[PDB]
Amino acid sequence: QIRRDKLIIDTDPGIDDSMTILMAFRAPSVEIIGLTTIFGNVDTKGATRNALLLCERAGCPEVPVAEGSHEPLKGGKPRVADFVHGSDGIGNLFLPAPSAKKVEESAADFLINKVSEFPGEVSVLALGPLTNVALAIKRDPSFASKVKKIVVLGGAFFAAGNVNPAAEANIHGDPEAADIVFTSGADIVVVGINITTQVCLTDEDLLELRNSKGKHAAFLYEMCKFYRDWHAKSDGFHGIFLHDPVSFTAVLHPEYFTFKKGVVRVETQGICTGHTLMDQGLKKWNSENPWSGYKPISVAWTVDVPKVISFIKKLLMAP
Amino acid sequence: IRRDKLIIDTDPGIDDSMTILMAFRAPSVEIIGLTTIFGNVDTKGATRNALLLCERAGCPEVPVAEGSHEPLKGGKPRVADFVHGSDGIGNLFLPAPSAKKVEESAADFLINKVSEFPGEVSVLALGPLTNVALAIKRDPSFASKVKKIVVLGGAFFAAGNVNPAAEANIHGDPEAADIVFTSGADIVVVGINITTQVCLTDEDLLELRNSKGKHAAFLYEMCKFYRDWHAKSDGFHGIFLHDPVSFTAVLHPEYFTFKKGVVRVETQGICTGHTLMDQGLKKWNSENPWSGYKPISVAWTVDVPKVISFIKKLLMAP
Ligand SMILES: OC[C@H]1O[C@H](O)[C@H](O)[C@@H]1O
Ligand SMILES: OC[C@H]1O[C@H](O)[C@H](O)[C@@H]1O
Numbered sequence: 001q002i003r004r005d006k007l008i009i010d011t012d013p014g015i016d017d018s019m020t021i022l023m024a025f026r027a028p029s030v031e032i033i034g035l036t037t038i039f040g041n042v043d044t045k046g047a048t049r050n051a052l053l054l055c056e057r058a059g060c061p062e063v064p065v066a067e068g069s070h071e072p073l074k075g076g077k078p079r080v081a082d083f084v085h086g087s088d089g090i091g092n093l094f095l096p097a098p099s100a101k102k103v104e105e106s107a108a109d110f111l112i113n114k115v116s117e118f119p120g121e122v123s124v125l126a127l128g129p130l131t132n133v134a135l136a137i138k139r140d141p142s143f144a145s146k147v148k149k150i151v152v153l154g155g156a157f158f159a160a161g162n163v164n165p166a167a168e169a170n171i172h173g174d175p176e177a178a179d180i181v182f183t184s185g186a187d188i189v190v191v192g193i194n195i196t197t198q199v200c201l202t203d204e205d206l207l208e209l210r211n212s213k214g215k216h217a218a219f220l221y222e223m224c225k226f227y228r229d230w231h232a233k234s235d236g237f238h239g240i241f242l243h244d245p246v247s248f249t250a251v252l253h254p255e256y257f258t259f260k261k262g263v264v265r266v267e268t269q270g271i272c273t274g275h276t277l278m279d280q281g282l283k284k285w286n287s288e289n290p291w292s293g294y295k296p297i298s299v300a301w302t303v304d305v306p307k308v309i310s311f312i313k314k315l316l317m318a319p
Numbered sequence: 320i321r322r323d324k325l326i327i328d329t330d331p332g333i334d335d336s337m338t339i340l341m342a343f344r345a346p347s348v349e350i351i352g353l354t355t356i357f358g359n360v361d362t363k364g365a366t367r368n369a370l371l372l373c374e375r376a377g378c379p380e381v382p383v384a385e386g387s388h389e390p391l392k393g394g395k396p397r398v399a400d401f402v403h404g405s406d407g408i409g410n411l412f413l414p415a416p417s418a419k420k421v422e423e424s425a426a427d428f429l430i431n432k433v434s435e436f437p438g439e440v441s442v443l444a445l446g447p448l449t450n451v452a453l454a455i456k457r458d459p460s461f462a463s464k465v466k467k468i469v470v471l472g473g474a475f476f477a478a479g480n481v482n483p484a485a486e487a488n489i490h491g492d493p494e495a496a497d498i499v500f501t502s503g504a505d506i507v508v509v510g511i512n513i514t515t516q517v518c519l520t521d522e523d524l525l526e527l528r529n530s531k532g533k534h535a536a537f538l539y540e541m542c543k544f545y546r547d548w549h550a551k552s553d554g555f556h557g558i559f560l561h562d563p564v565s566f567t568a569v570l571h572p573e574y575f576t577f578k579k580g581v582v583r584v585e586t587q588g589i590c591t592g593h594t595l596m597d598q599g600l601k602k603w604n605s606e607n608p609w610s611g612y613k614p615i616s617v618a619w620t621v622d623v624p625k626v627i628s629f630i631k632k633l634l635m636a637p
């Protein structure tokens with residue numbers, strides 16, 4: 001009935017990625033044109049397996065799943081967040097293998113091809129390390145102008161990281177890729193954990209979800225048991241933060257946030273590897289520095305927490 | 320009254336000069352020496368200004384010990400002459416002092432005084448931390464014997480002032496700052512996240528010039544250049560009070576709140592000079608560069624009216 005905006009989700013499912021993907025398949029204003037997978041919460045092969053299973057669970061096994069890079073741009077087999085998302089990446093449910101199969105092309109080929117087929121039409125929601133997006137940008141200098149918005153869940157702006165004091169997980173997963181994306185000149189919107197740690201579902205909210213008429217309520221509640229237990233052990237919070245679902249909310253309802261423009265750079269070496277730092281442009285520097293001359297991006301600054309929670313709950317609890 | 324022994328390590332420097340003159344007039348403080356470092360001006364220029372400040376305050380007997388001419392990594396340091404003027408005091412070009420520096424380097428002066436009075440000597444660090452790091456490396460007992468080190472430096476979850484990542488003192492010597500912060504000494508750090516909240520407007524500066532303050536004319540004259548830099552760079556008609564706020568933390572810690580946490584400094588890459596604190600509110604799954612070190616105190620909030628009132632009272636005192 002209503003106009004659908006084309007969206008590619010680049011993801012490492014992942015418990016909150018899974019919640020976001022299932023919400024996105026239910027959003028009537030969205031047309032998911034594909035899922036592109038990356039490592040982080042689980043190895044890339046595990047992320048592809050979960051993405052194919054989510055397409056089957058949502059009743060859309062025809063939605064293409066394109067497998068991305070198995071390692072960051074600097075190389076090396078990545079250590080994955082199995083202590084947060086379980087050994088299978090979805091809270092240790094150990095589900096049977098999907099029947100649907102991934103497409104032949106890589107995530108980077110898929111991103112380039114779709115953006116070239118529908119110029120200015122396709123937005124990218126990046127929910128994991130930015131390796132595939134950086135590969136597309138490096139391979140295609142016209143990608144930045146052809147893509148619509150790139151909404152990124154990543155970074156920690158003037159706030160503690162979540163892998164260590166300096167870095168947020170997605171950026172730490174591939175700092176070089178994040179620096180390439182943020183300096184690409186594309187229309188980028190970054191939602192850091194400085195924003196998403198303000199948006200939580202309590203144990204009571206999780207029980208409300210389990211008791212709801214939500215299409216995937218049972219599955220969402222089961223995955224969230226492991227996820228909630230990690231938040232209790234590590235952050236001392238009884239419930240879960242909503243990271244990937246808040247970035248999806250910034251795609252559909254940017255009016256629930258305020259944004260600041262600024263050049264963003266990523267530290268790629270030393271103790272602060274993975275740190276994201278924005279130059280707001282409020283001070284005139286005496287000399288040039290690593291933030292000089294780049295095109296600024298939009299950084300989520302404040303969030304209307306009740307409006308975001310209401311929107312997420314509505315999609316999760318929808319029959 | 321009983322006076323707390325204090326060594327001021329400094330790169331004077333316009334706000335360093337304001338702080339030094341305030342410290343010489345504080346009855347609860349005994350300034351046992353000034354140790355100089357580069358930053359706002361080359362070390363030789365900082366020594367010249369420190370000796371001139373001792374003369375101006377009527378205490379030319381106060382020892383001035385010259386410190387390192389370069390940061391620990393070596394090479395000629397960048398000087399903030401665009402902020403503090405070519406002479407480091409706002410282009411006043413005043414005659415050189417009669418008083419002379421002592422023979423001992425700043426690092427050896429710090430070591431010797433701390434060893435003479437274990438647990439009793441405090442250090443107020445107003446510039447890059449090179450001399451303090453040299454004292455820690457040269458004397459393994461220094462960190463345990465110094466009473467407290469109060470540092471004006473860093474930017475905690477806030478923009479730097481040399482570039483988006485780094486505050487000037489830390490950027491001046493990142494390796495030295497990392498040595499000081501991981502030394503295990505009783506350290507208190509006051510970052511520019513705190514001091515950019517404390518300002519003197521053009522009206523406050525005029526009130527100072529028109530006051531009966533002992534050093535009012537000199538302070539106002541130095542601040543002309545300083546204020547012009549703030550107008551051009553920060554878009555603020557007035558000055559921030561950086562070094563005087565750290566001195567206020569020494570005398571009136573009750574005007575601030577502090578958080579404990581391990582602090583590390585980035586020494587390479589685009590974020591060279593960045594200061595980052597681990598608040599310890601999250602249990603990490605595995606060890607990281609903030610693990611295992613002794614935490615330090617980081618100034619977190621400030622009662623701005625109380626700090627401004629204290630600084631103004633000291634600056635305007637006859
Ligand atoms: O730091 C949070 C992010 O890392 C993981 O990828 C989570 O799913 C989320 O995207
Ligand atoms: O960044 C401010 C500091 O740098 C300079 O040394 C100033 O005097 C102050 O100490």
Ligand SMILES: [Ca+2]
Pocket residue numbers: 011012013014016017041127128244
């Ligand atoms: Ca994710």
Ligand SMILES: [Ca+2]
Pocket residue numbers: 329330331332334335359445446562
């Ligand atoms: Ca100083």
